């Protein structure tokens, strides 16, 4: 059983404590041995070698996250599908990086569309225009 | 035991599905390989039951796509990692619906942030400001 915590920037390091706490409360409630309480700083979309190692290890039968979005902002249903085939599963212990994730999405999508030069400045004016209504 | 997989966002792009099936069978015939071509209409992220069925089937050892982004706009490296553990892999035959995916993403992210009411109109002004 792997307990897994994620945060976008090393500014949100206190949310990693709120995650580890809720995750060990989860584990102790079912008096379960924990092999790995894994804390990662990385993109909800960019490389995450701690989660790569966890997903590539067939021994990590149960992967416990606080919310679904900590494992991935997109594609979790597909990861669950791939894991299911190997009798491994993702557990969600409870049913905010989103605005920062809106910028990293738009940056990458702007880079591909109009070139990397100023792609983040484009994404910044865009995240801004999507605030008025 | 090789799955050829083709994806398109809207059933308006059904011509880009022909370009994928063609390139995918050219790929398979070059290595004289038996094919067990899956064509899907769906989100580069939203539900895709054809890919779910493929990923949940352990017999699908090789999953062939035209470009990485046809399997998923995000998270492909993690899918590859999970599959690798079961000796299964994703093959990419070649190294845009992106703008339609930029709206799809910003809508959902706007709906979570400021409420679903007008969330697509917010995403639309945003996808527009990122064009100058």
Residue numbers in the entry:
A (entry chain A): 52 to 96, 98 to 147, 152 to 189
B (entry chain B): 51 to 86, 88 to 96, 98 to 147, 152 to 188
Paper text:
TnpA binds specifically to the transposon ends and is a member of the SR family of DNA exchange enzymes, which are most often associated with site-specific recombination reactions. The SRs found in IS607-family transposable elements, however, are distinguished by the location of their DBDs at their N-termini (experimentally confirmed below). Although there is considerable structural similarity between the catalytic core domains of the subunits, the quaternary structures of the TnpA and smSRs dimers are radically different.
The TnpAISC1926 subunits are shifted apart by about 3 Å relative to TnpAIS1535, the TnpAISC1926 D helices are angled by about 15° rather than being parallel, and the TnpAISC1926 B helices are one turn longer than in TnpAIS1535. The active site serines of each TnpA dimer (TnpAIS1535 residue 59 and TnpAISC1926 residue 74) are separated by 28.6 and 31.5 Å (Cα atoms), respectively. The E helices are interrupted by a four residue β-turn (GRRG in TnpAIS1535 and GMRS in TnpAISC1926) and fold into an antiparallel structure. The split E helices from each subunit associate into a 4-helix bundle, with the C-terminal segments of TnpAIS1535 helix E rotated 35° relative to those of TnpAISC1926. Cysteines were substituted at TnpAIS1535 residues within the catalytic core and helix E region where they would be proximal and oriented appropriately for intersubunit disulfide formation. F126C, located just before the start of helix D, and Q138C at the C-terminal end of helix D efficiently formed dimers after oxidation. Within the helix E bundle, L162C generated substantial amounts of covalently-linked dimers and A182C generated a small amount of dimers after oxidation. These solution results substantiate the dimeric structures observed by crystallography. Nevertheless, we show here that the quaternary structure of the catalytic domain is active for assembling PECs, as evidenced by the robust formation of PECs by IS1535 TnpA dimers covalently crosslinked over the core subunit interface. TnpAIS1535 CTD native and Se-met data were both collected to 2.5 Å resolution, and integrated and scaled using XDS.
